[PDB]
Amino acid sequence: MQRVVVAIDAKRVDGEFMVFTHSGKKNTGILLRDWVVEVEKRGAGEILLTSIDRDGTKSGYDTEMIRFVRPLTTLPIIASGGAGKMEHFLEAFLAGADKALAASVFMRELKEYLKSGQAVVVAIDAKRVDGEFMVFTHSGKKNTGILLRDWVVEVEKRGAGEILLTSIDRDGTKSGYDTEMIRFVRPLTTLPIIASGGAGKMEHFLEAFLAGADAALAASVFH
């Protein structure tokens, strides 16, 4: 509820966990240790902690990084990058992550087992295509031909605990969240929705919550 989520991407550099920007390409020179605190103090309510070392590998989550960060923050940590098997969610949860972000999918048992507070987050990226909301994969480059409407429903049916809903249309713009898309999606799913793509002012978060978002992601207005 009104959760502000901050995306932190990190990677090992000379045996240190360094924070990266620009899709994990730019070494900011800031230590993961320092940023995680600064972010909490700055007022984040959740951390999406992406391991650039694991991101798309199937080898499992970066449990080392997760354990590294756990002592440093009180915030819920969503682990990201590396998932390939259901146990990995257990593996990440054991390491201290409060949630895990499922790998790019192009779950009903774990959902039942979690009894609460811990969830699997599923990323859905969508875009306007001929006035239709379509799911895209591949950083918004590939249309899947599946309607957002249908996929949100499917995802929930298949036992996801939460949806990370990225608007390819707003992502990178700093012009505000895709409130239209948020509103389209909201009645379709009972899952918490983390809105993503578009933040540019503190006022933009308010708009997303109003549009029906439970949490709002920003990778921009911090890093």
Alpha carbons within 13 A on the beta-carbon side of 156: 17
Selection from 98, 100, 150 nearest residue 122 by Cα: 100
Supply the DSSP string of 144-209, one letter for each residue: EEEEHHHHHHHHHHTT-SEEEEEETTTTTT-S---HHHHHHHGGG--S-EEEES---SHHHHHHHH
State how beta strands 3-13 and 16-21 pair. Answer: antiparallel
3-class SS of residue 123? strand
Element (H, E) at 127: strand 119-129
Selection from 55, 65, 79, 78 nearest residue 31 by Cα: 65
Q: How many CB atoms lie within 10 A of CB 186?
A: 16
The experimental method, as deposited, was X-ray
CA distance 78 to 188: 24
Residue 42 sits at φ, ψ, to 5 deg, of -60, -25
Per CATH, which fold does 1-223 belong to?
TIM Barrel (3.20.20)
Are 176 and 205 within 8 A, CB to CB?
no
**What are the residue numbers of the active site?**
9, 125
Resolution of this structure in Å? 2.1
CA distance 184 to 116: 28
CA distance 165 to 89: 20
